[PDB]
Design a protein around this ligand. Structure first.
Ligand SMILES: NC(=O)c1ccc[n+]([C@@H]2O[C@H](COP(=O)([O-])OP(=O)(O)OC[C@H]3O[C@@H](n4cnc5c(N)ncnc54)[C@H](O)[C@@H]3O)[C@@H](O)[C@H]2O)c1
Ligand SMILES: NC(=O)c1ccc[n+]([C@@H]2O[C@H](COP(=O)([O-])OP(=O)(O)OC[C@H]3O[C@@H](n4cnc5c(N)ncnc54)[C@H](O)[C@@H]3O)[C@@H](O)[C@H]2O)c1
Ligand SMILES: NC(=O)c1ccc[n+]([C@@H]2O[C@H](COP(=O)([O-])OP(=O)(O)OC[C@H]3O[C@@H](n4cnc5c(N)ncnc54)[C@H](O)[C@@H]3O)[C@@H](O)[C@H]2O)c1
Ligand SMILES: NC(=O)c1ccc[n+]([C@@H]2O[C@H](COP(=O)([O-])OP(=O)(O)OC[C@H]3O[C@@H](n4cnc5c(N)ncnc54)[C@H](O)[C@@H]3O)[C@@H](O)[C@H]2O)c1
Lengths: 307, 309, 273, 271
């Protein structure tokens, strides 16, 4: 492997072993479980609105507005009915969720409104306090939070308890003050690793904009696992690496196929979860040096020191 | 009374679970005979106009001095006042005896940090932006008004008008951490005036929060005179639960350590069994302690000592 | 008035002739003609809550505390009984109007400047409420940034309580934008305002947000007895304010406020028109 | 014709007669003169980077600046924007309305040259300092900058960084534009309903009270007639839309015909 990825893996594993690792799970991880992609929801909304699917791709503004246009034109009831139709299904958890949980992160920040992460956490027997609503922040039931910054469908499949339309994102800072500030605090005080997110995602753009206001070299650059079909360009890499990111390209390391995402995610994940006679003395000295401060050490305590 | 009893019960219940955070004001530092702000404001006023307030004046006079006499004069005048050391008072010991999850203080002194070192609980102190990112311990001593650890210059602290004006921009991480701690943990205000700048800013921010989505912070008032009832309603409807030290105990106005000591002794001494006198409440307490054990076929007799603390 | 005052008067007259002159009339001017100054109302409000009776923050809180505790009805009651007494417009109003200001910006809610404007024959489209901004019938505005009681004597029309100032930018977007545009595009002369006034300081912060030499520094007529301390004068001058000291302009006793106002007003009017 | 269309035309003409009409001209008016459309510059920057989505319009310039320096940024901007295109008939059509103010996000000097040709004098306000020194009573507001102080990228707000800091970088210009919108009647010409500036203005107008302002007229001249859904959506957002395609059946590519048709309808109604 390369040296940059070596440094990134070193830092990520170090932080995780200290209980300071947090996973910002994107929509790609949910899509790995064949969950309804948001582009399909936008296509359905556009078909209902204009009578035919849009020609070509959808821009981020389209994602934010087509749902909004349908909501204020076709009514709230139809907007929630489409969400019920597309999201009420329950999908199996892909290996990526269990791989992420295998790193025992201190917190799990996700913009997904599905329960796949919660199901994976329970399947691994992990007690995560899911904070998906405003009132959940105060009454936290556990030390580690599964913070769903885009809401979730626990309290019904209505579109009110989610961030999907243009108005939801526009008034998010006022709609979710406690949740947004808690997510920012977790980002500032933890080591964040992004998974399932695109560089063009709205949430990542907002987070990068917020990181601008921070003091120079005050925060820690969050790692971002990039697993888009194509290899990373050398221009976008520089652009986003001085923007506060620590991009780790999956396509750059693994020479895999396109539209074979699962294995591409797994390559980075298991490169993350898998962790001379001159370094032996260095290791022993590193283990024993603090013990020189003590007049005498019990041998069984020495067994303790060597894990 | 029932109101103060419930306040104390909530404070102690939060403290026992490790969900208690203490918002230490400047009164706790003054108890240690630390130079209060009004002394330094008077010094600045004398230097400016020759011969010697309000929330506006407190921020303005230092602000006027800063740009009228220069940064160096400001730093020197403030260091000649704040460089002196003081011994931590019993109120710091009482604050630390509650084992608070976090301590947020607008004081620029190290008395609270020294008390934390005394007690043996390592509170990673966060007084600068860089401190938030690299704080190994999970217990934060948040100096939301800067500190003199880096130096005794006026930039490190927030005590002038422009510093307060650009606080949100100047301290994004610190402000976010303080707000997250307020939203998550139980907050008790001690050593603060009811008409205080920091407390009013916190109330303004809390007004933005969704109704009943947060816990109303507790405010320990140690003013010499009992609080007016109207002000009590005004501040309790603004998101505060006021515990009045003057009301609990009658003491002469000139001395203040007695009021702080009374409030903190009520906090520390108070126990859930302290208030249960009705025989209908004895059974309530016993059932509250024993009910979860009904899920177990047999409970060791000796183990029951853990149930009843 | 060798340099720091003669130049101010010359610039003021040049702008007045050019027509790019605007007057920010403070509460003090409306007190030159007998009127309830807000501190008296604050004292009455506190006396209603308490036995006997001021910081600016207390200025904003005491009426706010009364509104929260006593209620809207009683608050509006004292407001109406105190502010419903008609008063005669003082010579300061017509002296201000004689300058032919393009607009008139005031944080007063009384009808003491519109009355002066009508009596002098000049028509200023009064803009005190939010909806009045768009439905403007005249080029020149008498903008009451603090509102007024024209619609009614209720307290919601005016901003005087702490909450009113807290949501002012949200409550009065169009009015705030219009006032900012008027300040930016016109030469502003502040009259009857405390140097440490809340409204003055908020505008000073807004101008601090503005870039260097991107605007004209407004003039501030200072009329209370004590000559301005040199350090305070330097501070406020560096804060984008040009101070004309009425106390230094003439020699008079502290309580003769009309004389101190008239000294500056007449020196500005008679001197080269 | 239509009752809604006739009412909108009558309101526009009435506001023009008393000097309240203000024209918000977008890039659609400037593309009639065959000025480089923004996607041209976006594509050039993209090709320079790696040898159109709306977010790309801001990203591509931003990344190109961050990588190839202000040097390459101003180089490309000056290369593409030194054409000196001739003003189209629609510029003079706009001027004939005798608008009180002309707010243009365009940086090309077609509009001010049109004003000079007509003889109307508009004080150009395209910089922070221009607001203070605006002598003329009527303002021609360039709320996106202009290439009259030079061909640097600092003058204009083309890239995403300028858009992000526009509110704090153009406080005087922004508030003056808001004042003009609030105190006048605004007609949008040459703007796409999905334009960044249009959406930001619509978001701003939300904060205004329900009956505080007047709903601006939007003159859409896109080749394809709008769907009823979009018309209903933007009608409730404060926009009063007059559809050029709906008004007259015309060629898809004959954008000039649609613009001219709407403009001469307005002029003839004004007499
Ligand atoms: N714009 C559209 O909605 C559209 C239309 C047709 C097809 N598609 C395909 O659907 C994908 C959806 O992604 P997006 O454009 O909505 O954001 P995107 O492609 O930028 O998001 C991709 C991020 O999400 C993940 N991801 C994307 N597609 C994935 C997949 N098929 N399997 C596993 N993970 C995947 C990746 O980790 C990637 O980093 C497009 O990337 C494209 O492949 C999209
Ligand atoms: N008001 C002034 O600006 C000024 C000027 C000179 C002296 N003083 C003196 O200081 C007191 C005002 O103090 P402030 O600026 O902190 O406002 P304050 O009195 O509102 O601050 C109050 C918090 O500080 C506490 N406090 C006050 N005096 C204390 C003392 N001796 N020991 C411990 N705590 C004390 C009270 O605890 C209170 O809850 C005045 O009552 C007066 O005795 C004030
Ligand atoms: N309770 C108090 O706050 C207190 C204390 C002393 C004097 N005062 C009275 O209130 C004002 C004290 O000065 P101030 O700046 O606070 O005023 P103010 O700030 O209360 O408001 C009025 C402003 O207008 C001018 N002005 C001052 N006194 C005036 C008067 N008697 N008549 C007309 N105009 C006047 C001043 O420039 C003053 O700034 C005066 O009216 C003074 O006689 C009040
Ligand atoms: N959007 C792109 O990146 C892209 C790429 C290739 C072609 N186009 C062309 O641009 C148009 C839409 O997007 P845009 O942002 O470039 O324009 P737009 O339609 O989004 O741009 C704004 C205004 O442009 C006007 N307009 C567009 N084409 C014109 C022409 N040939 N003559 C006169 N006016 C014209 C419309 O009046 C519209 O109101 C479509 O006509 C399309 O054929 C766009």
């Amino acid at each position: 492997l390369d040296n940059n990825v070596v440094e990134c893996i070193k830092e990520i594993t170090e932080s995780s072993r200290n209980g300071k690792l947090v996973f910002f799970v994107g929509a790609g991880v949910s899509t790995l479980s064949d969950y309804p992609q948001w582009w399909r929801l936008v296509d359905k909304y556009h078909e209902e609105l204009y009578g035919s699917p849009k020609k070509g791709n959808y821009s981020s503004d389209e994602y934010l507005r087509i749902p909004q246009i349908f909501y204020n034109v076709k009514g709230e009831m139809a907007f929630d009915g489409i969400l019920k139709d597309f999201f009420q299904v329950d999908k199996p958890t892909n290996p990526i969720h269990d791989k992420i949980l295998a790193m025992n992160p201190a917190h799990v920040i996700t913009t997904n409104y599905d329960n796949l992460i919660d199901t994976a956490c329970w399947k691994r027997g992990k007690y995560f306090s899911v904070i998906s609503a405003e009132e959940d922040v105060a009454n936290a039931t556990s030390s580690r939070y599964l913070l769903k910054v885009a809401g979730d469908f626990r309290k019904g499949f209505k579109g009110e308890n989610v961030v999907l339309k243009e108005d939801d994102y526009l008034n998010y800072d006022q709609n979710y003050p406690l949740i947004s500030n808690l997510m920012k605090t977790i980002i500032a005080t933890h080591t964040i690793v992004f998974i399932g997110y695109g560089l063009g995602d709205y949430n990542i753009n907002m987070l990068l904009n917020w990181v601008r206001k921070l003091q120079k070299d005050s925060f820690h650059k969050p790692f971002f696992i990039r697993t888009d079909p194509s290899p990373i360009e050398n221009e976008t890499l520089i652009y986003y690496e001085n923007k506060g990111l620590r991009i780790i390209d999956a396509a750059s390391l693994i020479d895999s196929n396109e539209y074979d995402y699962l294995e591409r995610y797994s390559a980075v994940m298991d490169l993350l979860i898998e962790s001379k006679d001159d370094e032996v003395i260095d290791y022993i000295y590193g283990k024993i040096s603090p013990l020189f401060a003590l007049q005498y050490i019990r041998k069984i305590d020495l067994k303790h020191v060597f894990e | 009374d029932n109101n103060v009893v419930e306040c104390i019960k909530e404070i102690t219940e939060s403290s026992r679970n490790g969900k208690l955070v203490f918002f230490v004001g400047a009164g706790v530092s003054t108890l240690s005979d630390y130079p209060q702000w009004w002394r330094l404001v008077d010094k600045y006023h004398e230097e400016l106009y020759g011969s010697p307030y309000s929330s506006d004046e407190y921020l303005r006079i230092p602000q006027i001095f800063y740009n009228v006499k220069g940064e160096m004069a400001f730093d020197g005048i403030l260091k000649d006042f704040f460089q002196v050391d003081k011994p931590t008072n019993p109120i710091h010991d009482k604050i630390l005896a509650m084992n608070p999850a976090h301590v947020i203080t607008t004081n620029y002194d190290n008395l609270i940090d020294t008390a934390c070192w005394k007690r043996g609980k390592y509170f990673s102190v966060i007084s600068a932006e860089e401190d938030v990112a690299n704080a190994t311990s999970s217990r934060y001593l948040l100096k939301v008004a800067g500190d003199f650890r880096k130096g005794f210059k006026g930039e490190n602290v927030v005590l002038k008008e422009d510093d307060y004006l650009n606080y949100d921009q100047n301290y994004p991480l610190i402000s976010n951490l303080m707000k997250t701690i307020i939203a998550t943990h139980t907050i008790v205000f001690i050593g603060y005036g009811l008409g205080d700048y920091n407390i009013n800013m916190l109330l303004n921010w809390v007004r933005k929060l969704q109704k009943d989505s947060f816990h109303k912070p507790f405010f320990i008032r140690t003013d010499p005179s009992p609080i007016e009832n109207e002000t009590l309603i005004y501040y309790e409807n603004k998101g505060l639960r006021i515990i009045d030290a003057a009301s609990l105990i009658d003491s002469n106005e000139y001395d203040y350590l007695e009021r702080y000591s009374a409030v903190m002794d009520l906090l520390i001494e108070s126990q859930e069994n302290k208030f249960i006198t009705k025989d209908d409440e004895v059974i309530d307490y016993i059932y509250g302690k024993i009910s979860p054990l009904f899920a177990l076929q047999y409970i060791r007799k000796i183990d029951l000592k853990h149930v009843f603390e | 008035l060798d340099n720091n005052v003669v130049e101010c008067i010359k610039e003021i007259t040049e702008s007045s002739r050019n027509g790019k002159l605007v007057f920010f009339v403070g509460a003090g001017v409306s007190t030159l003609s007998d009127y309830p100054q807000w501190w008296r109302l604050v004292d009455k409000y506190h006396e209603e809550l308490y036995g006997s009776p001021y910081s600016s923050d207390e200025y904003l809180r005491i009426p706010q505390i009364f509104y929260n505790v006593k209620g809207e009805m009683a608050f509006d009651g004292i407001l109406k009984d105190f502010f419903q007494v008609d008063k005669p417009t003082n010579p300061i109003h017509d002296k201000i109007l004689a300058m032919n200001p393009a607009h008139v910006i005031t944080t007063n809610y009384d009808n003491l400047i519109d009355t002066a404007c009508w009596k002098r024959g000049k028509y200023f489209s009064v803009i005190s409420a939010e909806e009045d901004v768009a439905n403007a019938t005249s080029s020149r505005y008498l903008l009451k940034v603090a509102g007024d009681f024209r619609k009614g004597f209720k307290g919601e029309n005016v901003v005087l309580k702490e909450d009113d100032y807290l949501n002012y930018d949200q409550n009065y977007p169009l009015i705030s934008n219009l006032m900012k545009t008027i300040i930016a595009t016109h030469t502003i002369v502040f009259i009857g305002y405390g140097l440490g006034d809340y409204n003055i300081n908020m505008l000073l912060n807004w101008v601090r947000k503005l870039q260097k030499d991107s605007f004209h520094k407004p003039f501030f007529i200072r009329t209370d007895p004590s000559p301005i301390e040199n350090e305070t004068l330097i501070y406020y001058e560096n804060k984008g304010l040009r101070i004309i000291d009425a106390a230094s302009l003439i020699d008079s006793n502290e309580y003769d406020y009309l004389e101190r106002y008239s000294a500056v007003m007449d020196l500005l009017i008679e001197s080269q028109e």
